[PDB]
Design an enzyme around this catalytic site. Sequence first.
Site, PDB file in Angstrom:
ATOM      1  N   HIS A  93      -5.454   5.397   4.645  1.00  0.00           N
ATOM      2  CA  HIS A  93      -4.156   4.230   4.668  1.00  0.00           C
ATOM      3  C   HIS A  93      -3.156   4.942   3.954  1.00  0.00           C
ATOM      4  CE1 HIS A  93      -2.159   0.533   4.079  1.00  0.00           C
ATOM      5  NE2 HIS A  93      -2.014   0.675   2.815  1.00  0.00           N
ATOM      6  N   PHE A 127      -1.750  -4.715   0.468  1.00  0.00           N
ATOM      7  CA  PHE A 127      -1.289  -5.298  -1.030  1.00  0.00           C
ATOM      8  C   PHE A 127      -2.036  -6.591  -0.860  1.00  0.00           C
ATOM      9  CE2 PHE A 127       2.758  -2.826   0.338  1.00  0.00           C
ATOM     10  CZ  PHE A 127       2.539  -1.905  -0.863  1.00  0.00           C
ATOM     11  N   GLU A 149      -7.439   5.213  -3.129  1.00  0.00           N
ATOM     12  CA  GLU A 149      -8.375   5.527  -1.962  1.00  0.00           C
ATOM     13  C   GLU A 149      -9.106   6.783  -1.961  1.00  0.00           C
ATOM     14  OE1 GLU A 149      -5.410   5.850   1.467  1.00  0.00           O
ATOM     15  OE2 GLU A 149      -7.260   5.599   2.826  1.00  0.00           O
ATOM     16  N   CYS A 185      -0.626  -5.503   4.798  1.00  0.00           N
ATOM     17  CA  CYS A 185      -0.776  -3.976   5.534  1.00  0.00           C
ATOM     18  C   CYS A 185      -1.999  -3.866   6.117  1.00  0.00           C
ATOM     19  CB  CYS A 185      -0.653  -3.019   4.305  1.00  0.00           C
ATOM     20  SG  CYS A 185       0.500  -3.289   2.990  1.00  0.00           S
ATOM     21  N   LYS A 224       1.149   7.994   7.757  1.00  0.00           N
ATOM     22  CA  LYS A 224       2.465   7.565   7.008  1.00  0.00           C
ATOM     23  C   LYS A 224       3.335   8.649   6.491  1.00  0.00           C
ATOM     24  CE  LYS A 224       0.476   3.071   5.792  1.00  0.00           C
ATOM     25  NZ  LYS A 224      -0.995   3.346   6.434  1.00  0.00           N
ATOM     26  N   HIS A 282       5.580   3.394   6.644  1.00  0.00           N
ATOM     27  CA  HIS A 282       4.604   2.221   6.503  1.00  0.00           C
ATOM     28  C   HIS A 282       5.614   1.129   7.366  1.00  0.00           C
ATOM     29  CE1 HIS A 282       2.144  -0.556   3.649  1.00  0.00           C
ATOM     30  NE2 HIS A 282       1.689  -0.717   4.877  1.00  0.00           N
TER      31      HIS A 282
HETATM   32 NA    NA Z   1      -5.239   4.862   8.326  1.00  0.00          NA
END
Ligand code: NA
Lengths: 415, 415
Positions: free
Chosen positions: B310, B403, B321, B170, B339, B344
């Site tokens: 993320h 990941f 996160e 990712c 996202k 994603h």
């Molecule tokens: Na980001």
Amino acid sequence: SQPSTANGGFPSVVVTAVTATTSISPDIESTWKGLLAGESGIHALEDEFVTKWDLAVKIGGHLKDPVDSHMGRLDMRRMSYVQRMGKLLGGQLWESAGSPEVDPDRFAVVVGTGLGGAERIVESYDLMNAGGPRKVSPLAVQMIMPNGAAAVIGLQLGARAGVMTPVSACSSGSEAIAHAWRQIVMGDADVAVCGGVEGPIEALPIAAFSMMRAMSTRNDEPERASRPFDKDRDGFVFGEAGALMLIETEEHAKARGAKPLARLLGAGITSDAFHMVAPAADGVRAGRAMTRSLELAGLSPADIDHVNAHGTATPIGDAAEANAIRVAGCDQAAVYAPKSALGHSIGAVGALESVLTVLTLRDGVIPPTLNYETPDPEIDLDVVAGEPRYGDYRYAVNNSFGFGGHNVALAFGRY
Amino acid sequence: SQPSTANGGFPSVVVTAVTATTSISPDIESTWKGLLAGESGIHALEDEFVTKWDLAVKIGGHLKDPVDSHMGRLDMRRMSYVQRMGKLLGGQLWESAGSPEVDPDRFAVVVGTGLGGAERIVESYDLMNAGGPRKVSPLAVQMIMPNGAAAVIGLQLGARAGVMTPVSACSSGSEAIAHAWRQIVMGDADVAVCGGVEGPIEALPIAAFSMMRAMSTRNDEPERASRPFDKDRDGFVFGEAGALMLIETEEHAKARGAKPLARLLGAGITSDAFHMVAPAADGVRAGRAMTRSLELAGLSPADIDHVNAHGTATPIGDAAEANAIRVAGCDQAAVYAPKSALGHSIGAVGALESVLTVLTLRDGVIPPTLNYETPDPEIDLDVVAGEPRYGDYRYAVNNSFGFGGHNVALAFGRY
Ligand code: NA
Ligand code: NA
């Protein structure tokens, strides 16, 4: 002035351990002794896919000691091949380094691969075609992505200052060492495990590269097929490999009592932007990668005693590299082409050759380039041949110029 | 002191052009206007593989304008999908930059991918099974290797100071921007095209990630499925993307009359070494990537006005996160999770989100995080929601935590 290793602008970085598995041996010191003895890892392929497809190429070097002879059922079901090779080599390297206790937060892993990190996808489809989406294992994601090998090694050894995977075909293993050196000299890490892994010799790679006319078809004399820089060369030969080295700051090595094998001084990465597979004939960008490594190292071309050539034995590849070496001012260097004995292993080979360059500096000896019998007038290099050349090698460049025009040069110094 | 962007130790680097294709639009400025309008790119999947396999996941965001609607027969036969996406975006970006004539030898390309650079291998087998090794095209090698997309763009645009491909699942697209910044600040290049590309939504990725319980299955309300940081989140949703930016030294931009959109100030790359797919719950190494970007930038956490998270919408991902953001001292920053609207796209998403961060700084506005209706007590972040938040954003960090525990943080400044 701009920073350099010589002027103290970059910290001093040393190679403190090495590991590799090759077509000659699983033990890097035995590979080395064999190269010095003139041994080749290249034999007749006994694989049934050769006769099944009647492949034009019937030669290559399988690993002397297959990875999977060291792998149990669990590893065989839950890792890709390159992940298994990585686990094996990672553990071997750590043990050779005296199993040191490093700070995880100053410890990086950078491991390249070429093709073979694309293995486990077909099997996932098959599971799904038969029994549906719920028959795909929850372990599939960790086996199919091309960073899997670096991920395995980082998890195995506890590296928390970055786990990276460059892909640049043949130069992936050298590029990995390049990026590990950068990670250290920019201050992100003090120690790194770096190198490359690659899958085994298989039918499709042979067919794909054969159809480019890139491969030797001298099937009757397998050990004589790979002839880098020789007038009668007819392409490369596959020889399996994986290789890793441990690099760290000199201060970090001294603090733990590690004996350096060599210095890693600088790294140059350039690109040809010329063609999707063929190298530029003029060798200008390739030579610039060499020059860049010298700039970063703080060396001049006249300092370079030895070049460990990319030397694949293709007609156009070796010609381009001779031009590169000249462009970089290193054409008085003693040249070795290990693919003469070890063959080509795409993502792993640059790492393997970087290890070999370290050993050359440590031992003051270059093995003979096998099959080098008739110099090619358009090459005009001082190629080591016949028997090992013992010499006062102070500095060396390892070249890796991969398909796609990816040029990596690494500058090493004797410790 | 150690070099930083603020102290002049690193040259000033600016973003001068951007391009992206998304589930909302092929035009990045229209994507941006749509995000600000609260639009989602996520819809019911109409693909026949959904009903064929009766997949648990029946939602996702296909590109608004398919890449191949721009591709002729030649490109369709001689490039992989990610190579076609790369060609398209590369050309679009160059045209947006005013088609500048740069020095090829100071021009780098760094383009990440996630999974989908593993497309063309099966077809090669098939050709061989039917008609044998000579039925494999001499073009196969240039279509099957995972660096193919970067190679295409470097050749298209004439980049001769390195063509690189990082793979870190990712975080591949962000890591590419990281390495491009390094290439410039270390003196190897003055200009770089960088970002990420990824394949389209397909059955096997859906099955593989679904079986990890990583994906939302809120099929009845597709636009409501992706809920980063929301109490009721149930995993991520795929949304297709590719994104590239042009970065260069401020001196290089000024010399050619380019108007910078933002500053790229620093980049941190760390690793969890915790688990093959799951992030570490404590967020410590992820937070350290943030901190590292600040160190290199020469900023303190208190300078950080905005974090582009993320934010995948997985239960464990968002929790980790939040801990990371706290560890880095940035938990007073205004947070956006794109996202929520864009889904994603593994290797491309970090690049897309880096583009979005640039636009936020340029325009002084953060779009609303979609579906953020019930704050989660264990998150405790200032998440932008409801309608765009207009603000004096001076500095921002874009997070990409892939990941495998690959953590990339990029520090950007308003120009
Ligand atoms: Na980001
Ligand atoms: Na070499």
